[PDB]
Symmetry: C4
Subunit: 276 residues, 4 copies
C-alpha cells in the first residue's frame, strides 16, 4: 500500500511543453444533472475546467444550460434530447464522467447503456454516484474494464460488490476489485484506491468537506487529470490527494469547505507542484 503525500503530485502533474495545443490536454464529456440536481454537474464542470482539461463538453438537462454557462462559459452544452450530437461527443471523448446529479430514470439508464456499449479501449470511463447504482442493477459486462473507474462511497460499494460495510476490509475490497478488473476509488473518511497494483491510501480529508457537492468536485478533478496526465492509476491518486489537500487547507479557516472553493484553487495549487 502506498500512503499518499505531495510526492504523488510532483509525479503526476507535469510541466506542459512550450508547443502544446488544447486537444493534447484531452476532450472530456461530463454526463449528469437531471432537472432537480443540475448543480451537481455544474460543480463537476467547474472542477474539470479549473483542473486544466483541454475541452469540456457537458451532457445535461437543457434546464441546466443557463446556470452552467453563467458559471462555466468554457463548456460546450448538449441536452439529453440531442441524440445524434450527444452520441457524437461521447464517441470523440478521451474521458467520460457519468453520474453527478444523474438520478435513476429511464433516460439515465439508456445513456449509461449507450456509453458502456460504445466504450473504446482508448477512453477512460468514470462511473460515479447514481451511475454506480444503475450499473449495479443492470448486469452489464465491461468490454475494457481496465479503463473504467468507479467512485463509490461505502454504500454504493455495497451495491456494486455485495460487501457489507463491516466486511469492506483491504483484502475483501481487493478481491472484489479483482473480480471487476476496474479501478475502485472507495470514498470514505480516508479514501482508498484499489486497482491491479498496490492500493493507494489517501491521507487527508476533514469533516468540513462533508457537504453536498464535494464528491462532484472530486469526480471532475479525476476526469480533468485523466484528460491530461499519464494513463496510470497514479494519476487518479493525484487527483484524490489534491482534492483533500486543498480541502484540508481551506478547513484551517473555513468551518465548512464549499466545493466551488476547492475548484477555484486548482490552478494555483497545480502550479506549485508541477514537476520542474
Amino acid at each position: 500500500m502506498r500512503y499518499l503525500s505531495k510526492d504523488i503530485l510532483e509525479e503526476v502533474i507535469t510541466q506542459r511543453p512550450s508547443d502544446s495545443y488544447k486537444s493534447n490536454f484531452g476532450r472530456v464529456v461530463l454526463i449528469g444533472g437531471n432537472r432537480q440536481y443540475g448543480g451537481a454537474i455544474i460543480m463537476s464542470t467547474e472542477a474539470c475546467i479549473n483542473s486544466g482539461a483541454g475541452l469540456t463538453t457537458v451532457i445535461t438537462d437543457v434546464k441546466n444550460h443557463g446556470p452552467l454557462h453563467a458559471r462555466c462559459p468554457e463548456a460546450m452544452v448538449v441536452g439529453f434530447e440531442e441524440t445524434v450530437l450527444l452520441t457524437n461527443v461521447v464517441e470523440q471523448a478521451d474521458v467520460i464522467l457519468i453520474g453527478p446529479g444523474l438520478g435513476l430514470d429511464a433516460t439515465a439508464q439508456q445513456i449509461l447503456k449507450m456509453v458502456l456499449a460504445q466504450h473504446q479501449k482508448q477512453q477512460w470511463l468514470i462511473i460515479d454516484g447514481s451511475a454506480i447504482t444503475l450499473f449495479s442493477q443492470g448486469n452489464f459486462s465491461l468490454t475494457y474494464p481496465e479503463k473504467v473507474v468507479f467512485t463509490p462511497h461505502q454504500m454504493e460499494w455495497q451495491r456494486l460488490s455485495h460487501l457489507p460495510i463491516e466486511q469492506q476490509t483491504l483484502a475483501n475490497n481487493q478481491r472484489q476489485q479483482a473480480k471487476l478488473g476496474s479501478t475502485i476509488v472507495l470514498k470514505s473518511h480516508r479514501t482508498t484506491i484499489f486497482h491491479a497494483g498496490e492500493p493507494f491510501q489517501n491521507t487527508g480529508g476533514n469533516p468540513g468537506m462533508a457537504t453536498g457537492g464535494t464528491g462532484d468536485t472530486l469526480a471532475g478533478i479525476i476526469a480533468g487529470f485523466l484528460a491530461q496526465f499519464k494513463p496510470t492509476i497514479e494519476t487518479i491518486a493525484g487527483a484524490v490527494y489534491l482534492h483533500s489537500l486543498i480541502g484540508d487547507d481551506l478547513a484551517k479557516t473555513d468551518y465548512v469547505v464549499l466545493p466551488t472553493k476547492i475548484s477555484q484553487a486548482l490552478p494555483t495549487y497545480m502550479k506549485k507542484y508541477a514537476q520542474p
Copy 2:
C-alpha cells in the same frame, strides 16, 4: 433572561467529529419564492449552505431555479408543481423552513397546510414571513408545537398573538408564547427569543442591516444551525447572535450591509468560535 454574547457561539458551534458524513449535518428543505420574490428564497439558501447544512433542497417556483443554481449549485431544486417529489422531500427533511418570498396565494396556503399536517416530532419547523400570516389566518392546531419556530417581526407578531406593538412587553410576549407552546423569535431592533425556558435577549443589530433580504438570511442560518447542532433553543439563539455579529462587523465599513455578505462570512466566523 440571558443576554447573548459570544459564549452562545462557543456553546452551540461544536467541532465536527473526524468521521462525519453529510447527513449527520442534517437535511433541510426551504420553501418559498413565488414568481415575484424568488430572490428571497435564494438568499435563505445561500445562508443555509454557508452555515454548514449537510444537504439543502429548495421548493420554489421553477422560474427561480436558474438564478438559484447560478449562485447556489449545492442545492437540489423542486418546483411547486412536482407534487409527489415535494411531498417526499418534506417527509425526509430534518428541518423545514417555510416563508421567504412565499407570498399569500392558494398554492402557498396548500403547501403550508401539507407541511403542518405531516409535521413529525423529530422535525424542526420554521415558519417565517408571509407563512406566519397564513398560519394566523388558517386556524391550525400544531401537533408538535415545541418543534415549531416562528420568526415574526413585530407586525406579524400582532397578527399571530393579537398583542399590539405597545403591549408587546416581556411578560405579555411570554404569555402568548406559552399559549402556542412554540418558540417565538421576535425580530426587532434588539431581537428576543421566547420559549419554555428563560428568554434570550440579543445584543447586536444595526440600521445598516435594515435592507431587504436580511430576515431571509437569518431564517436560512437558523435552519442550518438546527440542521447541525443540539435540538435546544440555545442553537436558535446562536444563529440570531451570529447573524447580527457579522452584520455589526460589516457595518463598521459598509453603510448598508448586503445580506449575501453576511452569508459569505459564515464559514470563517463559525471556525473562529467552534468549541475546541
Copy 3:
C-alpha cells in the same frame, strides 16, 4: 452656482438612527429593460440596492428576471404583462425611476403615460434615457413638476428643451428648466443640475466612464438617494457627485471604469462620508 465637493456628501448622507426599519429607507420602483437592453435595468438595480434603498422593485421584461436575480436577489421582479401588480407597486412607490433600457415601443409609452397619470405629490419621479424622448414626443402636462427629475444627456435635452447644443448655456438652460418647473440633471463631461434654486456644478468625471451603463448606474444612485435622504435637490447633487468621485478614483487604476464597480463601491464610500 454651487461647485460640488465632498461637503455635499457630508451634508446629504446622514447616519441612520439606531431604531430604523427598511421602509424608513424608501420603496423604489425601477422601470425599464426591454428584450434587448435588460442589462441596463440590471445595472440601475445593482446601484439602487448598493446605495441603501430600503426595498427595490423592478418592472422589466420577464426575459430579464433570471439574470437580474443572479446578480440582484434583493429585488422584487414584475413583468410588463402583470398589469394589476405593476400598477400596485407604482402606486406604493416612494421613488419611481423610468427609462434605463426602456426603448421606444407602445408598451413603453403606455407605462410612462400610466406613471405620469398617477404621479402623486409625495413621490419622486425620475425620467431617464428613452423615457425623456417619449415624454418629449407625447405632450404631457406634469401635475407635480417640482417632484420630477429629468436626467438628459445633451441630445435628449435638445429634444426636451429645443436648445441646440451650442445654445445650452447656463442662462438658457435655467430658463428652460423654469418653463418645466422640474429638476434637470444635464449630463455632460461636467454635469450641471438646474432647479428652482442655485444650480449645482459637478466637478468630477473622466473619459474612462464613457462606457455603456454608466448613466444607468447614476440613475439608480439618484433613485436610492431620494429613497433615503432629505427631499431637496442637494440629495440629487450628492448622488451625482458620489458617482463621479468613485469613477475618478477607479480611473486611477482602471483604463475603463466598469459601472458595476462603481455600484459595488457604494457601501464603503457612503460609510466614509456619513455625517457623524
Copy 4:
C-alpha cells in the same frame, strides 16, 4: 519583421481626451454562439467590454441571452431570429466580429453572407473560427479586403490558403495574405500577423493558455482595440501582444490560465501602458 514588445502597447493605447463620449470609442457587434457554444460568445463579449469598447451588441442565440446578461449586463442582446434589428445593428457597427461559437449551419452561413454583402469601407470585419471555414467554403469576393481581418489557427489557415502546415512559411504565408489583401492573424504557439506591411511577430504565449475560450477572448480584445484606436494593423498587434502578456503573467501563478481572468485584467493593464 517587427518583434512585438511593450512598445506596441505604448504606441497603440492612447490616453482618452477629457471630453470623450461612448460612441467615440466605437460600436461593436459580436456575432456567434449557437445553442451548444454560447459560452464562446460570452467570453468574447467580456473581453470586448473590458477592453474599453464604447458599446457592445451581441447577436447570438436567444438561449444565450440570460447567462450572457448574468456576466455582461453592459451588452445589448439580439437573437438570430430578429432579422430587421440584427440587420440594423450590423449596418451601424464600426467593428463586426463574426465566429466565436458560431458553428457551421445554414443560419450561420446566411448571417456571414449578409455581413459580407453589406460590409462597408469604414467598418472593420473580423472573421474568426468557424466563420473562416464558412468563408473558405463559400467562394466570396471581398469588396473591402483591407478592412477584413482573419484570425485562423494553422488548420483554418490551411482551409483558407491551401498551405499545408509544413509550408506555412513566412514567405508563403505572405504570398497568400497578398492574394487576399486582408490581415491574417495566424495563431500558433507564437502568433504572426501578415498584412500589406512588415509582418508582426508576437513574442509571448504559454501552454497554460491552451484551454477552450482563449481564442474567443483574443478575438474580443482585437474587436475592442479596433473600436477605439487607430485604424492601422499595429492596433491588432497591440491586442495580440496584450492578450499574451496578461496570459504569461497569470501563468506565473496559475497552471491553466482561465480566459475570463485575462479579460478581467484588461482595465489595469491598459492603464499601465496608456501613452502619457
